[PDB]
Every structure is written in structure tokens, then in C-alpha cells.
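Honest question from a wet-lab person: if I give you the sequences of every part of a complex, can you actually get the arrangement of the whole thing, not just the pieces? Trying it with mine:
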Amino acid sequence: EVQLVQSGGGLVQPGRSLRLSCTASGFTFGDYAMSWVRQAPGKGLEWVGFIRSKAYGGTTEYAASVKGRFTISRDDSKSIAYLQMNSLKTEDTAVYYCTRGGTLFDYWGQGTLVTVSSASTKGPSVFPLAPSSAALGCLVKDYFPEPVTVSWNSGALTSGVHTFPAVLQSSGLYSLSSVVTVPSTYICNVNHKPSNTKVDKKVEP
Amino acid sequence: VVALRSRVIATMPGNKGMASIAAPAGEVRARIGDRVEIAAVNGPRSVVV
Amino acid sequence: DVVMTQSPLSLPVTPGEPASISCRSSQSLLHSNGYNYLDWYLQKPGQSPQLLIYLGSNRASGVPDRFSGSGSGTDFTLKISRVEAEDVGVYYCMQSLQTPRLTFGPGTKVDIKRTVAAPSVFIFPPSDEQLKSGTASVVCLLNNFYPRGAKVQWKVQSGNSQESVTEQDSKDSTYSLSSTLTLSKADYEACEVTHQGLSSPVTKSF
Amino acid sequence: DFHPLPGFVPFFSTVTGRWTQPDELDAGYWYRNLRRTVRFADAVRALA
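Yes, you can. This is the full assembly:
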């Protein structure tokens, strides 16, 4: 069978280089033309560019937004595709896809988080949510990176629970709000794995 | 709940072991309390006390 | 010029019913070879997408034959015989006639069909300890509304609110919205939805 | 606490006569489990 598994995720700030490799196995690599797509978080995807097969030879197309920045190379003996980041900026914060064809993206890898953020790993500012008189919640402000899971009653309450997605503010930090909707003084906990900042909160109106 | 159960069995187990006596079910059901209460009545052949 | 390709967006599908998605093309995608040049893709929420139909009608392998499609020279129709619980995601009507391949289309986020619910507008003033921490975030929480066709207004105007919608759950088949109004210190001294669930605007402030 | 919690598969509490009560949530649950006889004869008759 076939697998275009990727590798090279990481956390970077704009202005440097990153590595993306696509492992090819189960087929002749020189027959298909490698392409690369980028998926912005929460919205639609966008073709980064592609390289043509060696037997064809051809050239390399990239998107109009990545001219002079990204290059793609290919090889048969080692059968690993290359997408190169150079001079990264904010819009590159997205999960990239390795696609198996110039015009027919007939196969798709799992995707690697290529994050170009202006923040570094820090601890979160958990803020509660006072009900009017209802639903009770607790904001998770200023955390980086995403790695966060939020449970209610320390993983005891599961009905009506939310983890709001990552929120993109201009500072490079993220925001999450977990809420439960049930009339009644609850426990919500946020665990940031990279920072080991274990926050427990008590909320009252 | 776990603390309660552990405390109940730890603070005072007593000296009551398990034994079987040959008594009829309804006959042995009359033994209530007084540290002689049945633990599991099982017909008229033999009953857990 | 660039082919204008806009499939009809927002096609909810409930398990066990026949649906059908169309698509648009500015000029004909039917080439001289007698074959159409549009591809059909479904985007997994959470992992990688897969191929549904190429040539406009020719189905790909691996996927079940339920994904049927056809079309005219311009009009196209990925005509899906039925949907199930796993048949939820974002359909992309990507035409393949003039590379470069940058635009896949806005994409058709599709979901489980259900009757229109009542959007639960929950106004939430920010915590006071946040106000002494240097920030302020009032959230007009919206829960259990469907479909997603509402935006939270901010009066007394808007512009500092962000958009943080999730995907669909299983047993409830509803949605919730998060309007986070990032605020500053001195300007702390009302939120609205225009969802189909109701008609008149419902006003509640902090 | 006075807030909702979820559950799991229902068991059959057999202390009172046979296995008829799903579970006793009273404060004397441990008391009746340790003092009140299971009355297993009826319980095992209904089991069989």
C-alpha cells in the first residue's frame, strides 16, 4: 500500500527556515509529481506549489504568495519529497499537506503543524466566568502553544461541556474558554503540558 | 466513599467469622441481630451465619 | 480569465436521505476530449481529506460507490445517494482546467440536518480580577443553535470581537459560538445575534 | 456536591430480600450491607 507521511513540524518565529519532508513508499516516486498544499486553521486550504517528475523534467510552480521563498525538490534513490521554508512570516502558521500529483491530489498525508508565531511557550492566564443569575465557564488566556485540555469537575462532568478552539490574537498568544450550561460553583482545570502550569479554579456568580 | 468504606472496615472489624449451620430458611431467618444474625440464608439445607 | 467556481454552500445532510450538491463554472469545463475537468474532495474535520470523484463523474477507488456524480458542460452535480454519521465534513468543488491550483473554493462545510433550534444568547461580563490584571474580555456566549448563520454584534461599536466556532457533536447535533470581545482598561465604562432561530433581535448587556 | 454526575452499567443490590433494588443511596447503605442479611435464599432462587 501507499503512505505520504510527513515530518518536520515545529515552533518558529518569522524570518527563519523550516524543514518539511514527505516519505514516499509503495510506488515509483519518479512517476507522480509532488505538490504541497497549506491548510489555514479553521478555514479552507490553499495550494503552495508543486514539482514535476524527472522523466518529464519540467519546472516548479509555486503559488503567487510564495514566489522567491519556497522551493521543492525530489529524488528517487531516497524517495523523500522536500518542501523548503525560507523567510517565514505570519501567514505560514498552518498545517501543510503533501499531495500526490500536480493536478490530481489523489493522495493526502496526515498533515504537520507548521506554526510561525511571534510568541514563545509561557503560562496561561485562566479567568473565570461569572453567571448573570445559566452557564458557568472559565477563560484560558495568553497560553502558547495549543497543547491544552480543559475538563470540568476535574474530568467528572461531560454533558454540555466545551473547549473553545484556539483564538488567534495579534500578539501571537492563544485563548480558550470552557463552559458548561446547566443550572445550579464548579471546578474547571487547565493543564499546559509544555509549561507544567496546573491551574485549578473556583467560580461563583 | 472510598475513605468511608476503608474507615468502616478498618476502625472495627470485630470478631465475627463466617460459618454454616443446618437450619431451615424461614427457621434461621428468625436470627436477627445479637451478633448471631444470618449472613446469607440458603434454603433449608445449610445457611450462612 | 480565472474560472469562477462556486458550489452551493451550506448543504446540511441527515443520515438516511438522498442529497445532491451542484457547482458553477464561468465558462465550460468540457474540453475537446469530451471529458470534464473538475474534481470533488471532502475535507475531514481533524485529519486528511480524500478523493470522491474525478473527470466530474469518474469515482476514485477505496471510497464506497455511494459518491456518485455527473454534470453538463457547465453545470455539475456531485449527487450523493445517501449520507451517514461519518459522512460529515467540507466538500471542495475544485476544477482542474487552468493551473496554477491555488484556489480550492471556500468549501462546503456540510452537517447533520435537524430542525431549527433557539439560539441561547448568554451575556457574560468579564471577571473583576481580569480588569485589574490589565485586560478585559466580555463574551456573549451562544450555545445550542443550528445552523450557524449568526454573528454577535457589540453595542455601547463592534470590531474588537473574534470568531471561535467549533464543529458538530453526535448526540445533540447543535453548535455553539464564542464572541470574545478583547477590551482595554479605560473603555469598560450589549450583544446581539441574528440567527434564523428567532426573528426579533434579543438584547442583553453586561 | 449539589451538581450533576454521570453513571455506568446498573448492578443489582440484593441486601433487601432478592436482587430487586438497583442500588441503595441512603446513608445506611454500608450499614445494611454489613448488618442486614442479604437473604440470599430468595436472591439465588431468583438468580437460578
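Two things worth pointing out. Residues 8 and 33 of chain B are 18 Å apart (CA to CA). Strands of chain B lie at 20-21, 47-48.
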